[PDB]
Point group: C2
Chain length 145, copies 2
């Protein structure tokens, strides 16, 4: 499946992990959080470790993945910031794909997490950046509505 997630990206993209690459289709069956963030954004820098801790605890139990959608435009800054994260990222050089996601989800501000269902493409939630702060165990994950 994962054909819902794949419709948000070119068919030829691979996501980057810490060690290799990941085909979007491999996220089938998961809730996928597009995390719009930048190393130069102070609230992003403070929110990232909150999301990292949640991912460490619940990635498998809640069956989700995070995909960084960078607003960094300098590759070394991107590299150092993504090094702090355990999840996936759109490659730094995929500038048009990054901008298409901003337009598609109407992302006016960072940090923002947009959750989609990888199989259907449906938007699952848009306020996780705020809701995670008062729900560290994710009892109300994925924070819909």
């Amino acid at each position: 499946m994962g054909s819902g997630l794949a419709k948000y990206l070119p068919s030829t993209i691979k996501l980057v992990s810490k060690s290799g690459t990941v085909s979007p289709i491999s996220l089938a069956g998961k809730t996928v959080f597009f995390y719009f963030s930048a190393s130069w954004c102070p609230p992003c820098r403070g929110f990232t470790p909150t999301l990292v801790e949640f991912y460490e605890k619940f990635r498998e139990s809640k069956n989700f993945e995070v995909v960084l959608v960078t607003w960094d435009d300098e590759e070394e800054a991107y590299n150092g910031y993504f090094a702090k994260m355990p999840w996936l990222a759109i490659p730094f050089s995929s500038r048009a794909e990054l901008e298409a996601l901003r337009s598609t989800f109407g992302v006016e501000t960072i940090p923002t997490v947009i959750a989609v269902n990888a199989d259907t493409g449906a938007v699952v939630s848009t306020k996780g950046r705020e809701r995670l702060l008062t729900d560290p165990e994710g009892k109300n994950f994925p924070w819909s509505d």
Copy 2:
């Protein structure tokens, strides 16, 4: 020559677009320049734009300022239709790296935002005009510095 404060923000090899033609960044010498980060797909942007248009029509001459759209649109027809509503200047749609560099330089986390700079010195003059214009339509406190 004046206007050297803009050289880093608006490289001289890329002219700005106007309603009728093109404009070199150096032509903004001596002015306060508002970088207006905005997108046609952003509802608060669509509502703020006419407020800024009215202020520009009334006061851009008397207060010696210019507005430069920094687009977050990624579709050219959307950019064209939205900039058509505006009387000021814009970074060309295709200048994607220049647009992104301004976002990083001024740390623009949200739109709509206006960042004012001094065209001669490059100094940041104000960052909250998007909010402060709303309650100061005559610009009595322009350029709304902190």
